[PDB]
Design an enzyme around this catalytic site. Structure first.
Site, mmCIF file in Angstrom:
data_model
loop_
_atom_site.group_PDB
_atom_site.id
_atom_site.type_symbol
_atom_site.label_atom_id
_atom_site.label_comp_id
_atom_site.label_asym_id
_atom_site.label_seq_id
_atom_site.Cartn_x
_atom_site.Cartn_y
_atom_site.Cartn_z
ATOM 1 N N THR A 1 33.711 19.506 0.282
ATOM 2 C CA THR A 1 33.912 20.064 -1.043
ATOM 3 C C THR A 1 34.990 19.218 -1.727
ATOM 4 O O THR A 1 35.879 18.700 -1.059
ATOM 5 C CB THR A 1 34.316 21.550 -0.970
ATOM 6 O OG1 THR A 1 33.471 22.261 -0.042
ATOM 7 C CG2 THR A 1 34.210 22.214 -2.327
ATOM 8 N N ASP B 1 32.074 19.993 -7.079
ATOM 9 C CA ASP B 1 30.774 19.437 -6.741
ATOM 10 C C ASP B 1 29.750 20.567 -6.627
ATOM 11 O O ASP B 1 30.045 21.733 -6.902
ATOM 12 C CB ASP B 1 30.851 18.611 -5.454
ATOM 13 C CG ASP B 1 31.348 19.413 -4.260
ATOM 14 O OD1 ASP B 1 31.857 20.534 -4.437
ATOM 15 O OD2 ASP B 1 31.197 18.931 -3.123
ATOM 16 N N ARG C 1 27.088 20.344 -3.806
ATOM 17 C CA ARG C 1 26.430 20.314 -2.507
ATOM 18 C C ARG C 1 27.008 21.388 -1.592
ATOM 19 O O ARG C 1 28.227 21.561 -1.524
ATOM 20 C CB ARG C 1 26.576 18.935 -1.860
ATOM 21 C CG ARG C 1 25.925 18.831 -0.495
ATOM 22 C CD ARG C 1 26.032 17.454 0.117
ATOM 23 N NE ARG C 1 25.155 16.487 -0.528
ATOM 24 C CZ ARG C 1 25.139 15.194 -0.229
ATOM 25 N NH1 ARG C 1 25.948 14.722 0.708
ATOM 26 N NH2 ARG C 1 24.306 14.376 -0.856
ATOM 27 N N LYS D 1 30.430 26.388 -7.713
ATOM 28 C CA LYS D 1 31.698 26.578 -7.027
ATOM 29 C C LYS D 1 32.842 26.944 -7.959
ATOM 30 O O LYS D 1 33.916 27.314 -7.479
ATOM 31 C CB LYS D 1 32.057 25.316 -6.246
ATOM 32 C CG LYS D 1 31.014 24.967 -5.221
ATOM 33 C CD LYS D 1 31.415 23.796 -4.375
ATOM 34 C CE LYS D 1 30.272 23.417 -3.472
ATOM 35 N NZ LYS D 1 30.693 22.356 -2.429
ATOM 36 N N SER E 1 37.048 19.180 1.376
ATOM 37 C CA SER E 1 36.969 18.092 2.341
ATOM 38 C C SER E 1 37.157 16.723 1.709
ATOM 39 O O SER E 1 37.726 15.834 2.350
ATOM 40 C CB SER E 1 35.627 18.126 3.071
ATOM 41 O OG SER E 1 34.569 17.841 2.178
ATOM 42 N N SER F 1 29.846 16.375 0.246
ATOM 43 C CA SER F 1 29.979 16.613 -1.183
ATOM 44 C C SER F 1 29.004 15.751 -1.973
ATOM 45 O O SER F 1 28.742 14.603 -1.609
ATOM 46 C CB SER F 1 31.401 16.300 -1.636
ATOM 47 O OG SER F 1 32.340 17.131 -0.984
HETATM 48 B B1 LIG Z 1 32.043 22.222 0.125
HETATM 49 O O1 LIG Z 1 31.534 21.246 1.192
HETATM 50 O O2 LIG Z 1 31.192 21.823 -1.101
HETATM 51 C C1 LIG Z 1 31.405 23.637 0.546
HETATM 52 C C2 LIG Z 1 32.224 24.781 -0.053
HETATM 53 C C3 LIG Z 1 31.421 25.854 -0.798
HETATM 54 C C4 LIG Z 1 29.914 25.819 -0.572
HETATM 55 C C5 LIG Z 1 31.962 27.233 -0.446
HETATM 56 N N1 LIG Z 1 31.334 23.820 1.986
HETATM 57 C C6 LIG Z 1 30.158 23.951 2.601
HETATM 58 O O3 LIG Z 1 29.192 23.269 2.308
HETATM 59 C C7 LIG Z 1 30.026 24.990 3.673
HETATM 60 C C8 LIG Z 1 30.194 24.363 5.047
HETATM 61 C C9 LIG Z 1 31.538 23.696 5.201
HETATM 62 C C10 LIG Z 1 31.614 22.309 5.274
HETATM 63 C C11 LIG Z 1 32.848 21.688 5.420
HETATM 64 C C12 LIG Z 1 34.002 22.458 5.501
HETATM 65 C C13 LIG Z 1 33.924 23.845 5.434
HETATM 66 C C14 LIG Z 1 32.689 24.465 5.286
HETATM 67 N N2 LIG Z 1 28.706 25.574 3.606
HETATM 68 C C15 LIG Z 1 28.477 26.882 3.592
HETATM 69 O O4 LIG Z 1 29.360 27.698 3.776
HETATM 70 C C16 LIG Z 1 27.072 27.346 3.355
HETATM 71 C C17 LIG Z 1 26.214 27.510 4.431
HETATM 72 N N3 LIG Z 1 24.959 27.916 4.214
HETATM 73 C C18 LIG Z 1 24.522 28.163 2.973
HETATM 74 C C19 LIG Z 1 25.373 27.998 1.888
HETATM 75 N N4 LIG Z 1 26.631 27.592 2.102
#
Ligand SMILES: *[B]([O])([O])[C]([C][C]([C])[C])[N]C(=O)[C]([C]C1=[C][C]=[C][C]=[C]1)[N]C(=O)C1=[C]N=[C][C]=N1
Lengths: 245, 229, 204, 230, 219, 238, 206, 272
Positions: free
Chosen positions: E1, E17, E19, E33, E129, E169
């Protein structure tokens, strides 16, 4: 139909007799206060009279500090007023911990009126026989200035803002002087010197005595110094001469 | 801690404590509301006890969420328990369904708060009624609870002092295809005929729920309406 | 793992004025088939159809609490539950038990009866809301379904030709997964009708 | 009628009788006096012994609350020991949490809120006691009186008991500005032997206690040979 | 993120972002987000989608409920206090990194909240991240009192340092401008990764999949 | 009298009748006489005489610890609820400090036990009086609690039915109690106890309980066998 | 798992069989212990597992069916209502203090019309269960070590139209395979059957 | 304080509970609602007070579950209320929860005697514990189960219930019992039962030409099942017909209200 008046029960005309009997505990000590707000300050005058000469005169007071920007006077049964100060100091502090900002004056008056409504709905609890007058200055919106505020909560729970209020014995003759004074000028345009003359003369027209400067105590909040503080006794004497003029 | 009940039955078979509370809920000031094909108007009457009581500070039309409003007539501080529990129960609906509450389900919840204190131990009933009105996914609504808990689905009504002769004036003036601007024209007009003096913009308070939103009218928008009737 | 103990993959695609949903027919205990004729889909009204995957003990217990809450919603509110309200309802159910969490992964498909807008939602086991406009998929063969669905989807599909893509995506992904297979049960649904089709598959 | 049976009942004019009936328990009790002597506070009371065989030191109405403060009670003795055992708990809290001795005006405001909290609820009755807080904290010598209503007030001198009206006029002849703690033990004890009559009780003695700079700011009772004989 | 924020001349600009990945595979490509808190307060979010959405909706309904009582515009310092006391009392189990931006009567307020509960009030913050790669763009090109256009382009050029360099991201730049008067939310402000080589669209005729039973239910 | 029903009701003269009504329970119990000496405290309780052959026994004098003991009068069902509290708080002391509890601390602990039961509405006072017989580093002590919550430090006292005559006897000899030995100190207590009896009864080993605590003497109750050395030779002379 | 349960349903009967072995880690305590608990007059359950949770789960289920017949004036509930009450006790126990029941069971029954207004199930009922709380209605279910030997045996030879004797000689083949390949000595198998006239204890196949 | 306790959970000196008996009198001025159990269904018919012209109909979806006087508890259970109006919604919510907690733990429809037992356990509970007033409400539970078919129950404000074949609660219930007693027979159709239901309703409120604005009806019969889904439930059997609680509209009750006045008119020409 046996008692009709001894606990919190609706009378057949739809009244609460323990509310109407707690209003009479306000006028029972025989004291009086007058609050007024000018364009840039708030004032609270109150009768500070000690009948015994053997009493330390800087211990008995009605002006309390709730938070460093909110002060109050308690007009009614004197140990009941000390009770609601300790309630309002808890609510202003628990607002500070939970929400991070200082409590608004209109919100501290509402949360103390909700405490008074519970005591007149549950049967066992006694209502507080005291009229509170929380005064302070709130942060205005869309410009950032400060603004004078006066808030009064009844023993029933009737909160509300005011331009000028009065509480205690012969509070009707103090309201009548302030409304008579309201017909000429506009009280939100007066200055701190001009508005101090009215609240002290309103305390004179009800007692009919033209009291001394030690027989009152005055607290104030000003837009330059927003903290609540009580005035010196030398500044009351500069006001009592102008009322005699 | 006085866990016995205060409201009981009479030898005639009537809850005489709630009968006293309906007398207390009819001694307030005149609050009313009308419906239309495009919205629902609620109208209040801010009775100032003096000229020194800051008429812009006191309020009687309470907005509950982005789609619900309310106006009472009875004991003021008793109403604030009902509004704070209705504003709380309407935010718990959005944290659970992601949807505005319907006006039906909010009034069922606050009617369970009236009935709760008519069957509890050590409390008295409420001494105030409400006028809940707003929108949902199936049109426009105007309800009216009682201190007994009995709620209704009115179309034009009034509560308070001078209410039975103002509700009869609503029978003579309502039409089934009243527009929204026609509703505000007649909601303010039925306040005047029972009003004592001369109503100003700081003397009454209205709120007309429009198309998704309740929106209590300001002092400039209500001044536009007083010099039109 | 506990999530891949029972087996089973549920996916859904979005079309023009329709959506599909399709599960497999296998129930198991980590290698051995317990049943061969068990779907994972659930229908609550003529607009919302959802599918559960994960641990079969939680697939039945959670679906009893949903049916306890959907029928209580219809008694209180005199109306059928909508898709955005149903998906946000059981999002909250998977978040209340966040430290004792359910081992389900609900795949929600819904449609507006009067408007015609489809709404997909696939939460995680801890209730993470996520609404793609194209497709959702969960289960043991979920990593194989993101390749099949993304290389074959287009936004403007008819209901008859959206079924042909979702059926060839489920079967080709279950021929590579040893915890899903044994045919598939699909359900295409439009504004006007609901059609439930059972699909030939490998009996391996 | 039923308007004076508990504490949660205001009268027809806004009075609470069970508080005011508790004030008649202090007015029918033994005589109390006090004095603030510009470096300390002296408090004296008269112990009405009901038998010849009571040990000297029995029924002492003066109790030490902190090292610098102590509450003498006037009214019912067992009701005032709930006030003493509460104000000790209020003074132990400031030493253990805030690392500071409790101030004189703050200890009295904690007494007046404990005595007031039993005048607002139906299940409780008010105290038959007037507590006299004599303190010497970092705000100087303090002398407070808490009545059964919960009202606290700073005094220079106070008379409480039966003959509190005759002993009040005997306090108006003292000075309180040039008055010291050396002379006032002989003065205040001589108030009690003149304000009180021996034609009702035969056994009466006095109990004096101070806190001042000569006693190293410590609330102590007297050495027995400083009190006048009669 | 790769959520970022920048204080400009009058207000703040929040960036994010789109993703969202569940375990090394892209779950969603157009997740949102930048959340809603108040008419003057927005809040970016990183970490878990369950924990970010459920800490935000609870506080944003608590700020709304506290707004009907006061009748005034909500502070951003009270939005921050409700977030930091929630995230502290679960001791980092609620894995949500937050970037909070708003405007009050006291000016723009940009501050971040760590998942353990610590707060930092800065002119520019990055979380997530790709926060390290996005900070290096902000440390090289931030200056005091930028215009609305120079801050909106500095924010968007900092998201693309997390799009093209952090694998967790990408796919879009979400930009939310917070002013004193209004608030402008654009989603398609910068889409640097377009669709190269559109799909062949393998056609399958309706009926080529073998079906054993079918049941049609009219409505 | 409509101000005597509840415990939390003051009279319009400022009296508490439910506390004054519990004080009549102590004045109706059996007569007991406590006499304090220089190093000894002697309790002399008057238990019930047999009905012409059959001997009813009812325990009044209680041991609280090695150095404490008490004799009750009034409601004996509340005198054992006090005996549960006093014995427990002397075990909790000697657990912590490994020494006996002082009597000035203990007399202040009974008075707060009577005080919790005289201010709540659904509670009642303990209708029983006590006579603590204690010894500590400060020497012998003799206390007496009443249902009001008071606690009085005596030189000699007597409570019970018709114990005013025993108190009249002790108000002539209480100046000569720091000079007598133990054998004379028992004799002043039994001559006092014999003046509270009926018109046609005198003392013997069948109706008297003698309890002695001292400096090298733990709290010892002298019943039937060992009490004969002070009770066989005894005559109430005029 | 050391002891097997074999059950298959047919057109007008449900066979059950459960080996009566009870052991202490290698020592045969019994050889004839009844592990097929008769819940109702038309319902029974064949639980497998160690003897601790197995009695205490079946006594809680059996005494609550009887209590629900006391409070409902002797009205016998359906087989699906009993089976759904059972897995409620498995599923609520895996998330509790005391822990999960280590019982694997096969529910069996026959549905009779209790009145003239009952238009429910007429046929037989057979439910596979698990220790976690899985519930599945199945043509035939098996537990234990020898389950996989005999589930693929019933893939070969089971027919929906088997008679009382043809399914009796099928169960004999089911018992002789467990004696042939499983190292655990299962010698006595307790064959019972549920028909329209209640339960019956088959003496022949053992 | 203990002085003003009204002592609701105490006996009289003749063994009577006054707060229960005064709750019975509160139902005597409530709106009259009658039910009658036929062989192929059970119908409820009640009277609501006069429609003021400023009432509004709350525009719901699927109007078969919440009327003015009749309420749906479960898909196989209906009810109707005479007593305190706001007091019934607490027990109506409690009856809907217990009927759905049974389907959670058993996955079967609850018996009608089983619900009527579990809501009368609540009503007796406030007559003996708590020292507060009891529920001043009376119910008429109807519904179909597979144990005894169509059932009809009463509910007293003391915890007591009884099964019935026709019953009356509200104003003039002693009158409406005798009119149902004069003509009720076993082999009765639903059209003969609904015509019986409307005809006795006009007798108590002494009104020839039964008005449709002042009469609310609701019938409890079995309709053919339409939501059967054998494909997602391969080993689950669905019954042929399912019971549906419904409430008749004005287009549904007008063909039945014009048969009750004519049957009143058919017994009017043969009066002299
Ligand atoms: B960030 O990478 O864009 C994002 C934060 C936002 C979606 C809350 N994180 C994610 O993509 C998370 C996983 C993650 C990755 C790296 C560090 C911490 C967390 N993904 C999810 O929580 C998720 C899972 N399934 C469906 C939808 N979202």
């Amino acid at each position: 139909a046996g008692f009709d008046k001894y606990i919190t029960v609706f009378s057949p005309e739809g009244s609460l007799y323990q509310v109407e009997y707690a209003f009479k505990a306000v006028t029972y000590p025989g004291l009086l206060t007058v609050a007024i707000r000018c364009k840039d300050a708030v004032l609270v005058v109150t009768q500070h009279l000690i009948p015994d000469r053997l009493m330390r005169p800087d211990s008995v007071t009605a002006l309390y500090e709730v938070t460093p920007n909110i002060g109050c006077c308690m007009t009614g049964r004197a140990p009941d007023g000390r009770a609601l100060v300790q309630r309002a100091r808890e609510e202003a502090s628990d607002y500070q911990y939970r929400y991070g900002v200082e409590i608004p004056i209109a919100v501290l008056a509402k949360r103390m009126g909700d405490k008074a409504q519970v005591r007149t709905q549950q049967a066992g609890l006694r209502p507080m026989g005291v009229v509170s007058t929380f005064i302070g200055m709130d942060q205005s919106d869309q410009d950032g200035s400060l603004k004078p505020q006066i808030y009064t909560v009844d023993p029933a729970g009737w909160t509300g803002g005011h331009i000028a209020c009065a509480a205690g014995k012969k509070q009707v003759e103090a309201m009548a002087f302030l409304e008579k004074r309201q017909k000429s000028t506009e009280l939100d345009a007066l200055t701190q010197k001009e508005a101090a003359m009215i609240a002290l003369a309103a305390l004179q027209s009800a007692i009919g005595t033209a009291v001394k400067a030690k027989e009152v105590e005055v607290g104030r909040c000003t837009a330059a110094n927003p903290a609540f503080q009580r005035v010196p006794n030398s500044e009351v004497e500069e006001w009592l001469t102008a009322v005699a003029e | 801690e006085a866990f016995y009940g205060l409201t009981t039955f009479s030898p005639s078979g009537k809850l005489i404590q709630i009968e006293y509370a309906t007398t207390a809920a009819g001694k307030g000031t005149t609050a009313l509301g009308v419906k239309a094909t495009d919205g629902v108007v609620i109208a209040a009457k801010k009775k100032a006890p003096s000229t020194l009581v800051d008429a812009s500070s006191i309020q009687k039309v309470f907005v509950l969420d982005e789609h619900v409003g309310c106006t009472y007539s009875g004991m003021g501080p008793d109403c604030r328990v009902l509004i704070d529990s209705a504003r709380k129960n309407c935010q718990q609906y959005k944290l659970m369904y992601n949807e505005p509450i319907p006006i039906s389900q909010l009034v069922r919840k606050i009617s369970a708060i009236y009935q709760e204190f008519t069957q509890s131990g050590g409390v008295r009933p409420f001494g105030c009624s409400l006028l809940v009105a707003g929108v949902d996914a199936n049109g426009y609504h105007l309800y009216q609870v009682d201190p007994s808990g009995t709620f209704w689905a009115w179309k034009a009504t009034a509560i308070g002092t001078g209410s039975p002769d103002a509700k009869a004036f609503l029978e003579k003036r309502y039409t089934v295809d009243m527009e929204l601007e026609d509703a505000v024209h007649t909601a303010l007009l039925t306040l005047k005929e029972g009003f004592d003096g001369q109503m100003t913009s700081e003397n009454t308070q209205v709120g007309r729920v429009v198309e998704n939103r309740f929106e209590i009218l300001s002092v400039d928008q209500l001044r536009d309406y007083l010099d039109q009737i | 793992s506990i999530m891949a103990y029972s087996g089973g993959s549920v996916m859904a695609m979005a079309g023009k004025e329709c959506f599909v949903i399709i599960s497999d027919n296998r129930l198991g205990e980590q290698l051995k088939t317990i049943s061969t004729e068990v779907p994972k889909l659930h229908v609550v009204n003529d607009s919302i159809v959802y599918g559960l995957t994960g641990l079969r003990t939680d697939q039945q217990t959670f679906a009893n609490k949903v049916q306890f809450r959907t029928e209580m919603y219809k008694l209180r509110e005199e109306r059928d539950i909508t898709g955005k309200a149903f998906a946000a309802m059981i999002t909250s159910m998977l978040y209340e038990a966040r430290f004792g969490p359910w081992f389900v992964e609900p795949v929600i498909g819904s449609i507006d009866k009067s408007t015609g807008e489809v709404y997909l939602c696939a939460t995680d086991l801890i209730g993470a809301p996520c609404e793609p406009e194209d497709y959702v998929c969960a289960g043991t063969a979920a990593e194989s379904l993101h390749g099949m669905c993304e290389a074959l989807w287009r936004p403007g599909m008819s209901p008859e030709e959206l079924f042909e893509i979702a059926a060839q995506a489920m079967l080709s992904a279950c021929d590579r997964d040893s915890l899903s297979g044994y045919g598939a049960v699909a359900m295409i649904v439009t504004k006007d009708k609901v059609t439930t089709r059972l699909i030939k598959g490998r009996k391996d | 009628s039923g308007h004076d049976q508990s504490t949660d009942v205001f009268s027809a004019e806004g009075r609470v009788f069970q508080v005011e009936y508790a004030g008649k328990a202090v007015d029918n009790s033994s005589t109390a006096v006090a004095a603030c002597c510009k470096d300390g506070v002296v408090v004296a009371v008269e112990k009405v012994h009901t038998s010849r065989m009571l040990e000297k030191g029995s029924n002492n109405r003066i109790h030490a609350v902190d090292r610098q403060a102590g509450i003498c009670i006037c009214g019912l003795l067992p009701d005032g020991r709930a006030i003493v055992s509460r104000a000790r708990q209020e003074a132990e809290n400031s030493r253990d949490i805030f690392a500071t001795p409790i101030r004189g005006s703050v200890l009295a405001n904690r007494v007046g809120e404990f005595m007031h909290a039993y005048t607002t609820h139906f299940a409780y009755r008010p105290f038959g006691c007037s507590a006299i807080i004599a303190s010497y904290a970092d705000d100087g010598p303090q002398l407070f009186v808490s009545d059964p209503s919960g009202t606290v007030a700073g005094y220079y001198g106070v008379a409480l008991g039966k003959a509190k009206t005759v002993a009040k006029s005997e306090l108006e002849k003292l000075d309180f500005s040039s008055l010291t703690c050396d002379e006032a033990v002989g003065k205040l004890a001589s108030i009690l032997h003149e304000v009180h009559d021996k034609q009702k009780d035969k056994l009466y003695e006095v109990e004096v206690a101070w806190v001042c700079d000569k006693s190293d700011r410590k609330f102590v009772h007297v050495p027995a040979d400083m009190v006048p004989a009669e | 993120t790769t959520i970022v924020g920048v204080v400009y001349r009058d207000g703040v600009v929040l960036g994010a972002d789109t993703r969202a990945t569940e375990g090394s595979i892209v779950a969603d490509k157009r997740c949102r987000k930048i959340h809603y808190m108040a008419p003057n307060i927005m809040c970016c979010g990183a970490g878990t989608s369950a924990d970010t959405e459920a800490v935000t909706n609870m506080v944003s309904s608590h700020l709304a409920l506290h707004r009907l009582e006061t009748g005034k515009q909500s502070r951003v310092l009270e939005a921050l206090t409700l977030l930091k006391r929630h995230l502290y009392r679960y001791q980092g189990h609620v894995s949500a990194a937050l970037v909070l931006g708003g405007v009050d009567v006291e000016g723009p307020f940009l501050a971040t909240i760590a998942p353990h509960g610590s707060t930092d009030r800065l002119p520019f913050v990055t979380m997530g991240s790709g926060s390290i790669a996005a900070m290096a763009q902000l440390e090289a090109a931030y200056k005091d009192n930028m215009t609305c256009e120079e801050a909106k382009e500095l924010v968007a050029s900092a998201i693309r340092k997390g799009i093209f360099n952090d694998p967790y991201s990408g796919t879009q730049v979400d930009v939310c401008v917070i002013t004193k008067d209004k608030t402008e939310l654009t989603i398609g402000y910068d889409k640097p990764n377009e669709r190269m080589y559109p799909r062949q669209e393998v056609l399958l005729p309706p009926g080529t999949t073998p079906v054993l039973k079918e049941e049609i239910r009219q409505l | 009298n409509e101000y005597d029903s509840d415990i939390t009701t003051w009279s319009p003269t400022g009296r508490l009748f439910q506390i004054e009504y519990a004080n009549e329970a102590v004045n109706n119990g059996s007569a007991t006489v406590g006499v304090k000496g220089k190093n000894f405290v002697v309790l002399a309780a008057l238990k019930r005489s047999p009905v012409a052959e059959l001997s009813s026994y009812q325990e009044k004098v209680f041991e609280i610890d090695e150095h404490v003991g008490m004799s009750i009068s009034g409601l004996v069902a509340d005198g054992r609820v006090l005996a549960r509290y006093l014995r427990t708080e002397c075990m909790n002391y000697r657990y912590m400090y490994s020494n006996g509890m002082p009597m000035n601390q203990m007399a202040d602990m009974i008075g707060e036990k009577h005080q919790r039961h005289i201010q709540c509405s659904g509670k009642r006072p303990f209708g029983v009086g006590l006579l603590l017989a204690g010894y500590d580093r400060q020497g012998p002590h003799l206390y007496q609690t009443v249902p009001s919550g008071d606690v009085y430090d005596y030189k000699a006292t007597a409570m019970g039915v018709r114990s005013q005559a025993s108190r009249t006897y002790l108000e002539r000899h209480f100046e000569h109690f720091s000079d007598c030995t133990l054998d004379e100190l028992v004799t002043h207590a039994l001559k006092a106890l014999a003046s509270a009896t009926s018109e046609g009864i005198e003392l013997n080993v069948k109706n008297t309980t003698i309890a002695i605590v001292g400096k090298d003497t733990p709290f010892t109750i002298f019943e039937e066998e060992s009490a004969r050395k002070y009770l066989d030779g005894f005559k109430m002379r005029p | 798992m050391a002891e097997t349960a074999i059950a298959f349903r047919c057109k007008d009967y449900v066979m059950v069989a459960a080996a009566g072995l009870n052991a202490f880690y290698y020592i045969k305590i019994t050889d004839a212990e009844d592990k097929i608990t008769q819940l109702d007059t038309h319902q029974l359950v064949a639980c497998t597992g160690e003897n601790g949770p197995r009695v205490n789960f079946t006594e809680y289920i059996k005494c609550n069916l009887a209590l629900n017949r006391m409070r409902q004036h002797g009205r016998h509930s359906s087989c699906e209502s009993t089976a759904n009450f059972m897995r409620n006790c498995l599923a609520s126990a895996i998330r509790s203090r005391e822990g999960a029941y280590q019982v694997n069971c096969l529910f069996a029954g026959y549905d009779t019309p209790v009145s003239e207004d009952d238009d429910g199930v007429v046929g037989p009922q057979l439910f596979y269960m698990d220790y976690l709380g899985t519930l599945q209605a199945v043509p035939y279910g098996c537990h234990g070590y020898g389950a996989c030997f005999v589930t693929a045996l019933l893939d070969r030879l089971w027919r929906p139209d088997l008679s009382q004797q043809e399914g009796l000689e099928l169960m004999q083949k089911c018992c002789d395979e467990v004696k042939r390949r499983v190292i655990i000595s299962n010698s006595y198998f307790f064959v019972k059957a549920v028909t329209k006239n209640g339960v019956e204890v088959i003496t022949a196949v053992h | 304080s203990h002085r003003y306790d009204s002592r609701t959970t105490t006996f009289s000196p003749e063994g009577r509970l006054y707060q229960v008996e005064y709750a019975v009198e509160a139902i005597q001025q409530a709106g009259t609602v009658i039910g009658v159990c036929t062989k192929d269904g059970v119908v409820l018919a009640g009277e609501k007070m006069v429609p003021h012209p400023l009432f509004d109909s709350e525009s719901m979806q699927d109007k078969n579950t919440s009327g003015e006087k009749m309420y749906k508890i479960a898909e196989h259970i209906g009810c109707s209320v005479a007593g305190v109006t706001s007091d019934a919604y607490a027990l109506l919510n409690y009856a809907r929860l217990s009927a759905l907690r049974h389907q959670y733990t058993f996955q079967e429809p609850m018996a009608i005697e089983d619900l009527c037992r579990i809501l009368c356990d609540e009503k007796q509970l406030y007559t003996q514990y708590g020292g507060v007033r009891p529920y001043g409400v009376s119910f008429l539970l109807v519904g179909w189960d597979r144990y005894y078919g169509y059932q009809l129950y009463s509910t007293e404000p003391s915890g007591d219930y009884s099964a019935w074949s026709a019953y009356a609660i509200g104003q003039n219930d002693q009158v409406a019992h005798a009119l149902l007693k004069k003509d009720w027979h076993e082999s009765m159709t639903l059209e003969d039962g609904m015509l019986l239901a409307l005809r006795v309703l006009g007798k108590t409120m002494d009104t020839a030409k039964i008005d449709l604005d002042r009469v609310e009806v609701a019938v409890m019969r079995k309709v053919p099942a339409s939501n059967i889904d054998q494909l997602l439930d391969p080993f689950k059997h669905h019954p042929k017909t399912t019971p549906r609680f419904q409430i008749l509209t004005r287009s549904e009750l007008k063909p039945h209200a014009e048969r009750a006045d004519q049957a009143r008119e058919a017994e009017e020409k043969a009066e002299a």
